[PDB]
Amino acid sequence: SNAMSIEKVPILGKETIHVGYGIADHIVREVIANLASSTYVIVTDTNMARTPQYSKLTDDFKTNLSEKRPESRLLTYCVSPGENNKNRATKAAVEDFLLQQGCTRDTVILAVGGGVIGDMIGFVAATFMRGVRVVQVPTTLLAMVDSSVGGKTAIDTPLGKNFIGAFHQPEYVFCDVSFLETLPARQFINGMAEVVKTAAIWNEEEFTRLENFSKKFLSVVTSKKPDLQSIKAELVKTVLESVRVKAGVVSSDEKEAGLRNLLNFGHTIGHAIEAVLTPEALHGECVSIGMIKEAELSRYLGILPPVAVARLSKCLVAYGLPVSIDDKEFLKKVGPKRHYVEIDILLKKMASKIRCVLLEKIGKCYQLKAHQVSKQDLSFVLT
Amino acid sequence: SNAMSIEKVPILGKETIHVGYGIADHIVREVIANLASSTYVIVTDTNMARTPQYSKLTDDFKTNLSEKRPESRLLTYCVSPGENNKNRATKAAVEDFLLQQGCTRDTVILAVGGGVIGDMIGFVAATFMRGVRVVQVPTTLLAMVDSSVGGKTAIDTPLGKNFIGAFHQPEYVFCDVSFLETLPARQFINGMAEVVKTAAIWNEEEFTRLENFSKKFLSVVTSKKPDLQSIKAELVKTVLESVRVKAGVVSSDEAGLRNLLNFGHTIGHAIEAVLTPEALHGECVSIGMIKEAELSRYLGILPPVAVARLSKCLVAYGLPVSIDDKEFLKKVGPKRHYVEIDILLKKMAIDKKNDIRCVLLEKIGKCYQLKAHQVSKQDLSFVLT
Ligand SMILES: NC(=O)c1ccc[n+]([C@@H]2O[C@H](COP(=O)([O-])OP(=O)(O)OC[C@H]3O[C@@H](n4cnc5c(N)ncnc54)[C@H](O)[C@@H]3O)[C@@H](O)[C@H]2O)c1
Ligand SMILES: NC(=O)c1ccc[n+]([C@@H]2O[C@H](COP(=O)([O-])OP(=O)(O)OC[C@H]3O[C@@H](n4cnc5c(N)ncnc54)[C@H](O)[C@@H]3O)[C@@H](O)[C@H]2O)c1
Ligand SMILES: [Cl-]
Q1: Where are the beta strands (DSSP E) in chain A?
Q2: Which of A265, A271, A263 is nearest to A246 (CA)?
Q3: Domains and CATH numbers, chain B
Q4: Under a CB-based contact definition with an 8 Å cutoff, are residues B125 and B133 in contact?
Q5: Measured in whole angstroms, how far is the alpha carbon of residue B122 from the centre of its chain?
Q6: Where does this protein hold NAD(+) (chain B)?
Q7: Does B303 touch chain A (CB under 8 A)?
Q8: If DSSP codes are grouped into helix, strand and coil, which group holds residue A236?
Q9: In the sheet where B73-79 sits, what is the strand order?
Q10: Which chain A residues touch B99 with a CB distance below 8 Å?
């Protein structure tokens, strides 16, 4: 906000998720002051490496470290971008760099990038000398609200995604919304799927604010040179209220286990679709369609009222997301893969009951847990 | 085998370390009954794969599983032996096999082999879908008493050893002493360094037993046709009492006890870095224990008689007590001449670049103040010069 340059969210009792706009300064001081180390390492990709905000961070990091901890060193390393580099070779290359540099157990690694970087460099930190401190610095909307929080790290293999990895909690998550200034529009919209999800499963008031923000958001993000400063407060609030839900649910799952599954709203059906249509369909695009199908499932089972289905769909369309696999622009993105989406391959991906979130209303999940549903009922909504 | 065949040792208050001699059936029953899964995977190396006891274990596993869990399956995978294969490419190969065979989060992996297998397959389990259940089945003496216990897993890189890994506690450790029937003598003897070490840091009564057992142990192990069954009971006790000490230390709260396990390793790892691979780890740790004991004696802590005693016991088990041991010089050859004081000091310092500490023995079976102690480059130099 105007009144608070940094807003914090607790995770497992500690306020280590920090959100603001143009906070390189704060990131650097917080890290150096609280995570004492001989060696700090910023890891990024090529795309992020070229942006002005990235240079501001490393510059700020360099200067403060020179003042505060003269004996300590800052190191930087860049991987190539893309899901195709989220692999064993890249992990090994980052490690070989850390080892050549004589990094030890005290090393602090900052993962500056989207979910690819966050997951992969999180995993590097998880196994480096059997674990070193990592700080998540997410730079995509998706990564800011979802992937940076919860400690899930991984890489892909030629057989499938995120099959090798580790649970490794970050010391901090810093969401500097000003990084979104360079994010391509499609990726920005993709990220709103998780934002709408968190409001839909937990916060109707935020859902209302999102509806009221949609037109000016979509108008700025799709303009030629997006002016993000003009909607700065509203973007900070967007990231804040979504990550609050993710962090709250992760923390609450401690004592009320199974609340964590509510974060899967739209992912049961959406992951099944994305399995068929990746990489032409992005994850948020598939999650949006999934939330609608899953909402229709709750409706068909006599739980979600039909008006809430309509309200959810209106909000997703207003943020530029598809609400069925037959959406015209979505058909354009997926082309010849459209016809691969048959009911049978979807029921197979989702495997013989299936677990699914059943929305009760906007802002609330039915009985605060996931439910086992039959293949017959899922077939009905997918027919 | 039955209940009478098995000695258990607790780790963090649960009896998951089981020791016996000829216990493949027990291993099978215990895993299948306690670790319910669709898929059990036994991973080993070429050398172990061809031994009779390995086949006994896998045959028994197959038979019992198809009876008790007919819808489950047993898979097997074999890697090449050697520290040179304790690497990323092998870890990936094992993972690709698992994935190609459709293994999921319920998979139970058994690591049947020495410490290379234990550490590497342990690490495969640690990261597979972010972690699956692993069972350590150590087959060297060293692995039965030390490496299988404590949850440390790793592989090596060209820049050094055990740098990439994970802490991943095994569901069970099964030490079947019958695997030692096919262990080459040099490796069998190598394992005795850690056995002597555990007795020396913690259990003077066991040290006495090991002294009394030494002549017999060595004549059996170094014969042409070793008959291990004739010393069965005493070998089981040997394993049991060393792994007891490791497990008790791992189970502590009283942090600082963990460092007592490093007795012999401060100087020993430095010697090994210069002399590997011609010298084995336990051979260097033996020498290391002697020098660290001399250090404690020099500092006025350890009485001289302890150094004599330790030295006699180590040699009676076929281990060297100096870098100029006749047989040790044959193994290492021209690398001996690179063991200078400055490179040892450099390595001991590199090993503590995060944080030079050393265990100081107070007498046989007791460490001074139950913790490691900072020692100077001068005093180490004095003892190594
Ligand atoms: N850990 C979890 O629980 C979790 C949850 C959801 C997704 N994920 C993971 O997240 C990954 C997808 O992440 P993503 O959607 O952030 O994609 P991404 O990291 O692939 O980034 C998308 C593209 O944007 C570039 N980029 C990132 N930030 C930028 C910025 N500020 N300006 C300009 N360009 C930028 C990247 O170089 C890349 O080309 C997947 O691999 C998925 O497995 C993880
Ligand atoms: N995790 C830990 O805390 C820890 C502690 C100490 C050592 N280690 C590790 O242990 C490894 C060394 O283990 P090791 O000393 O068991 O060596 P190893 O695993 O290399 O085995 C030695 C040799 O014996 C063969 N072999 C093993 N058991 C056999 C048997 N019963 N019959 C016939 N052949 C057999 C192997 O194929 C190999 O050729 C090192 O890589 C080291 O990093 C780990
Ligand atoms: Cl790995």
Answers
A1: 7-11, 14-20, 39-45, 73-79, 108-113, 133-138, 152-157, 160-167, 172-176, 354-361, 364-373
A2: A263
A3: 1-182 (3.40.50.1970), 183-385 (1.20.1090.10)
A4: yes
A5: 14
A6: 45-47, 83-86, 114-116, 119, 139-140, 161, 179-182, 190
A7: no
A8: helix
A9: B7-11, B14-20, B172-176, B133-138, B108-113, B39-45, B73-79
A10: 157, 159-160, 163
* Residue whose entry in the numeric block shows the structure tokens 């609030």: A237
Judge contact between B139 and B165, C-beta under 8 A: no
* Rama region for B369: left / alpha / beta (φ>0; ψ in -120 to 50; rest): left
Give the integer Cα–Cα distance in Å for A371 and A361. Answer: 16
Contact B220, B318 (CB under 8 A): no
- How many angstroms separate the CA of residue A181 from the nearest CA in chain B? 34
A254 C-alpha to center of ligand 1: Å?
27
What is the token pair recorded at A382?
A: 């997918």
Specify the amino acid at residue B311: S
Question: What whole-number distance in Å separates Cα of residue A230 and Cα of residue A209?
Answer: 17
Looking at residue A320, the DSSP 8-state letter turns out to be T
Are B162 and B119 in contact by the 8 Å Cβ rule? The answer is: yes
Secondary-structure percent of chain A, ordered helix, strand, coil, rounded to 5: 55, 20, 25
- Token pair listed for B347: 């390595």
At A61, the amino acid letter reads: F
Strands B39-45 and B73-79, by their bridges, are: parallel
Secondary structure element (H or E) that encloses residue B41, with its range: strand B39-45
Last residue before each gap in chain B (C to N over 2.5 A): 253, 355
Closest CA to A179 of A322, A49, A275, A373: A49
Q: Which residue has the tokens 């020179």?
A: A66
Looking up tokens 């009676």, which residue turns up? B316
Residues at the binding site of B are 45-47, 83-86, 114-116, 119, 130, 139-140, 146, 152, 161-162, 179-182, 190, 194-197, 246, 258-262, 265, 281, 352
DSSP code of B169?
Answer: -
Whole-angstrom Cα Rg for chain A: 21
SS3 call for B183: coil
Give the C-alpha separation, A252 to B41, whole Å. Answer: 35
Q: With 0-12 CB in 10 A as exposed, 13-18 as middle and 19+ as buried, what is A123?
A: buried
Q: Which helix (H) or strand (E) holds A194?
A: helix A185-202
A20 and B CB contact within 8 Å: no
Tell me, using a 6 A CB cutoff, whether residue B187 lines ligand 2.
yes
CA distances from A302 to A358, A368, A373, A383 (A): 10, 16, 13, 18
Write b or e for each residue in B215-236: b if 16 or more Cβ atoms lie within 10 A of its Cβ, otherwise e. eebbebbeeeebebeebeeebb
CB-based contact B159 A105, cutoff 8 Å: no
> Chain A to chain B, count of Cβ pairs less than 8 Å apart?
66
Give the contacts of A211 (CB within 8 A, at least 6 positions apart). A314, A315, A318
* CA distance to A27, A291, B31, per residue, from A324 (Å): 40, 10, 47
Question: Kind of pairing, strands B14-20 and B73-79?
Answer: unpaired
Q: How was this one solved?
A: X-ray
How far is it, in rounded angstroms, from Cα A128 to Cα B165? 7
Task: Find all residues with CB under 8 Å of A63, minimum gap 6, and list them.
Answer: none
A140 lines ligand 1 (CB under 6 A): yes
Resolution, given in Å to one decimal, reads 1.9
Cβ neighbours for B135, distance < 8 A, ≥ 6 positions apart: B27, B31, B35, B108, B109, B110, B111, B170, B171, B172, B173, B174
Measured from the Cα of B190, ligand 2's closest atom is: 15
Closest residue CA from atom 9 of ligand 2: B115
